[PDB]
Structure formats: structure tokens, C-alpha cells
Write an enzyme that holds these catalytic residues in place. Structure first.
Site, PDB file in Angstrom:
ATOM      1  N   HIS A 112      40.643 -19.112 -52.201  1.00  0.00           N
ATOM      2  CA  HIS A 112      40.179 -19.759 -52.548  1.00  0.00           C
ATOM      3  C   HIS A 112      39.498 -20.566 -52.618  1.00  0.00           C
ATOM      4  O   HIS A 112      38.687 -21.238 -53.180  1.00  0.00           O
ATOM      5  CB  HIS A 112      41.115 -19.851 -53.750  1.00  0.00           C
ATOM      6  CG  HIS A 112      42.144 -20.664 -53.255  1.00  0.00           C
ATOM      7  ND1 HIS A 112      42.487 -21.756 -53.227  1.00  0.00           N
ATOM      8  CD2 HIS A 112      43.727 -19.836 -52.879  1.00  0.00           C
ATOM      9  CE1 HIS A 112      43.551 -21.749 -52.833  1.00  0.00           C
ATOM     10  NE2 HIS A 112      44.611 -20.871 -53.042  1.00  0.00           N
TER      11      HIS A 112
ATOM     12  N   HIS B 261      41.380 -29.978 -48.270  1.00  0.00           N
ATOM     13  CA  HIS B 261      40.083 -28.360 -48.582  1.00  0.00           C
ATOM     14  C   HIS B 261      39.246 -29.016 -49.174  1.00  0.00           C
ATOM     15  O   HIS B 261      39.255 -30.302 -49.500  1.00  0.00           O
ATOM     16  CB  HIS B 261      41.247 -27.138 -49.184  1.00  0.00           C
ATOM     17  CG  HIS B 261      41.070 -27.521 -50.432  1.00  0.00           C
ATOM     18  ND1 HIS B 261      42.398 -28.867 -50.600  1.00  0.00           N
ATOM     19  CD2 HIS B 261      40.578 -27.619 -52.292  1.00  0.00           C
ATOM     20  CE1 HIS B 261      42.641 -29.229 -52.050  1.00  0.00           C
ATOM     21  NE2 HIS B 261      41.482 -28.738 -52.878  1.00  0.00           N
TER      22      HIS B 261
ATOM     23  N   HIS C  59      35.562 -27.616 -52.261  1.00  0.00           N
ATOM     24  CA  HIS C  59      34.996 -27.105 -53.488  1.00  0.00           C
ATOM     25  C   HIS C  59      34.073 -26.930 -53.766  1.00  0.00           C
ATOM     26  O   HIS C  59      33.342 -28.224 -53.529  1.00  0.00           O
ATOM     27  CB  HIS C  59      36.077 -27.381 -54.668  1.00  0.00           C
ATOM     28  CG  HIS C  59      37.472 -27.487 -54.939  1.00  0.00           C
ATOM     29  ND1 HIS C  59      37.758 -26.525 -55.169  1.00  0.00           N
ATOM     30  CD2 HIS C  59      38.396 -28.491 -54.394  1.00  0.00           C
ATOM     31  CE1 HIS C  59      39.355 -26.977 -55.470  1.00  0.00           C
ATOM     32  NE2 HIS C  59      39.577 -27.597 -54.780  1.00  0.00           N
TER      33      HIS C  59
ATOM     34  N   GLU D  92      34.208 -30.563 -58.377  1.00  0.00           N
ATOM     35  CA  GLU D  92      35.208 -30.517 -59.709  1.00  0.00           C
ATOM     36  C   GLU D  92      35.120 -31.723 -60.808  1.00  0.00           C
ATOM     37  O   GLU D  92      34.676 -32.065 -61.620  1.00  0.00           O
ATOM     38  CB  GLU D  92      36.677 -30.647 -59.118  1.00  0.00           C
ATOM     39  CG  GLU D  92      36.742 -29.449 -58.795  1.00  0.00           C
ATOM     40  CD  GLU D  92      38.130 -28.774 -58.438  1.00  0.00           C
ATOM     41  OE1 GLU D  92      39.019 -29.695 -57.980  1.00  0.00           O
ATOM     42  OE2 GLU D  92      38.038 -26.732 -58.513  1.00  0.00           O
TER      43      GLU D  92
ATOM     44  N   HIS E 112      39.399 -32.632 -50.708  1.00  0.00           N
ATOM     45  CA  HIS E 112      40.166 -33.227 -51.887  1.00  0.00           C
ATOM     46  C   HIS E 112      41.116 -33.016 -50.471  1.00  0.00           C
ATOM     47  O   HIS E 112      41.080 -31.608 -49.427  1.00  0.00           O
ATOM     48  CB  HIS E 112      40.918 -31.946 -52.735  1.00  0.00           C
ATOM     49  CG  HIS E 112      40.401 -32.172 -53.678  1.00  0.00           C
ATOM     50  ND1 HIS E 112      39.875 -30.938 -54.738  1.00  0.00           N
ATOM     51  CD2 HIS E 112      39.358 -33.661 -54.571  1.00  0.00           C
ATOM     52  CE1 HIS E 112      38.653 -31.866 -55.518  1.00  0.00           C
ATOM     53  NE2 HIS E 112      38.686 -32.611 -55.530  1.00  0.00           N
TER      54      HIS E 112
END
Ligand SMILES: NS(=O)(=O)c1ccc(O)c(NC(=O)NCCc2ccccn2)c1
Ligand SMILES: [Zn+2]
EC number: 4.2.1.1
Length: 257
Positions: free
Chosen positions: A61, A91, A93, A103, A116
């Protein structure tokens, strides 16, 4: 199993994780004119000098860099927080294109990516216990926009070709996460959740106002990762972001005017 595709993506997660429709879900849109300046909020204390990175992993993910959290080595304190939070991992996104990927959003603006830095409250002893507490985790969120390169990201980018597919990991020692931070520690804060399953409502979110800039070449390397495992049909790891969720009965506070 959950993911970011049409049949397993964010609109499906509530079936396995009903808290997806809960009262303090993340991410959210940060409406800057409605966030209230709180003069009682303290400066964030980011103490990363003794950080010990361990491994970098493709978990299907995102990609994650993990740290030694068995001692107070890299800790976050102050700001809206009570007590001491140890850095466990970071990590990202990101999107398929530069106009999406974050996000959190800011006045509905999406950034190209979001970092994050995940920390857990030492009063709960371990991260598994912390995730079951409303003040168990503090996630420092940092927006990425595309333009000039971020030199402190390059060591991460250059190892991604060794963890292309789900389940691959590599030793990733001596990485200094201070190289990922913008100049200002001005922030917004609100009570929220993990943005991936299990979506636990255990996070004090601290989202920095100032984005970092990364180059197009750096973000292109994120987009070459794979969601799939080795030998499976290749599905590029892109658009691994959850959209903004209802703010419900929450106020976002700003540390600055
Ligand atoms: N994206 S986030 O809100 O910073 C964040 C921070 C810490 C976390 O543990 C998570 N969630 C996470 O890592 N989930 C791993 C996959 C999983 C774990 C347990 C049950 C179902 N799925 C998200
Ligand atoms: Zn995240």
C-alpha cells in the site's frame, strides 16, 4: 483484501472496518478560514538527532522506512501533545499525476503527495496498545509539491528500485529524517484516525502548513513502485490516498495566525 482499486478501494473499506464511517475519521479538508488560531498551542518539538532507521519496505500500500522505537531516540513532543511520542516509521501517499496524491487537502487543494511520520505515545508502551487509545498516535503530515528537488529525499528515492513489489524490503540504516522537514513548523491539528485500515481513531494529526518541494524525477520514482507482488500482473502503485472524510463534530486548530 483492501486496496485502492475500483472493487477494494476507500468506498469499500467500511465493510471490513465499519469505523470507516466513524466520528473522527481522517484525512479531512483543512478549511483555512475556518480553522481557529489557538494561542495556547505550543511549538512542536521535533527531536530527530538520535534517529536510528532500520529497514525500508514495500507493504503493498506504500513504502515505509522503519525506525528503532525501543528507546526515546527520535521523538515528537509539545504542540498539542501531552507526553512523548516515539517515531516508528514514515511512509508516503502519492498520485498518478501531480494534481492529486495528498490525503489532507487545504481549501480543497490536493498536493502531489503527503509524508506521514508516525509516532506513538510512550505511556502506552507499544504501538499495538497505542492504537487502541484516543491519544495513542501522533502523525506529522507534510505536503509535497513538485518543483525543485529535496536533497534529503534522494537516498530514499534511489533504493526504491530494490523494493519494487509487495513484500520486498532492504536494509536502510543511517537515514536522517530531518532532511524531509520544511523550514516552518507552523501546523494545523485535529483529532482523527489512521487513513488506512484498520482506520483506528487513535491519531492526533499535526499537519504542517509549509510543503516541501520534490522534483518531478523524485516523484516519478514513487510511481514506478508496484502494488502487486513479484510475478503478478503489474499494477503501478499510484493514487494510494484516501479522500477527505466528513469533519463532523471537530474543530481544526492552527498554531499560527
Ligand atoms: N496513513 S497513517 O494514518 O499515517 C497510518 C499510520 C499508522 C498506521 O499503522 C496506519 N495503518 C497501517 O499501517 N495499516 C497496515 C495494514 C493493516 C493493519 C491491520 C489491519 C488491517 N490492515 C496508517
Ligand atoms: Zn499515511
Amino acid at each position: 483484501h483492501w486496496g485502492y482499486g475500483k472493487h477494494n478501494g476507500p468506498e469499500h473499506w467500511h465493510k471490513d472496518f465499519p469505523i470507516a464511517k466513524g466520528e473522527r475519521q481522517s484525512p479531512v479538508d483543512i478549511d483555512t478560514h475556518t480553522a481557529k488560531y489557538d494561542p495556547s498551542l505550543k511549538p512542536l518539538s521535533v527531536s530527530y538527532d538520535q534517529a536510528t532507521s532500520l529497514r525500508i519496505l514495500n507493504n503493498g500500500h506504500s513504502f515505509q522506512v522503519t525506525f528503532d522505537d525501543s528507546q526515546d531516540k527520535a521523538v515528537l513532543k509539545g504542540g498539542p501533545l501531552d507526553g512523548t511520542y516515539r517515531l516508528l516509521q514514515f511512509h508516503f501517499h502519492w498520485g498518478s499525476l501531480d494534481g492529486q496524491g495528498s490525503e489532507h487537502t487545504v481549501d480543497k487543494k490536493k498536493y502531489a503527495a503527503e509524508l506521514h511520520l508516525v509516532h506513538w505515545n510512550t505511556k502506552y508502551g507499544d504501538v499495538g496498545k497505542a492504537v487502541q487509545q484516543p491519544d495513542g498516535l501522533a502523525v506529522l503530515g507534510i505536503f509535497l509539491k513538485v518543483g525543485s528537488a529535496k536533497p534529503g529525499l534522494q537516498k530514499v528515492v534511489d533504493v526504491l528500485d530494490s523494493i519494487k513489489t509487495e513484500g520486498k524490503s532492504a536494509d536502510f540504516t543511517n537515514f536522517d529524517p530531518r532532511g524531509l522537514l520544511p523550514e516552518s513548523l507552523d501546523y494545523w491539528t485535529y483529532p482523527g484516525s489512521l487513513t488506512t485500515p484498520p482506520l483506528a481513531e487513535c491519531v492526533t494529526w499535526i499537519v504542517l502548513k509549509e510543503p516541501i518541494s520534490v522534483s518531478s524525477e523524485q516523484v516519478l520514482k514513487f510511481r514506478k513502485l508496484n502494488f502487486n507482488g513479484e510475478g503478478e500482473p503489474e499494477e503501478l502503485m499510484v493514487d494510494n490516498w484516501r479522500p477527505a472524510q466528513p469533519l463532523k463534530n471537530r474543530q481544526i486548530k492552527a498554531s499560527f495566525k
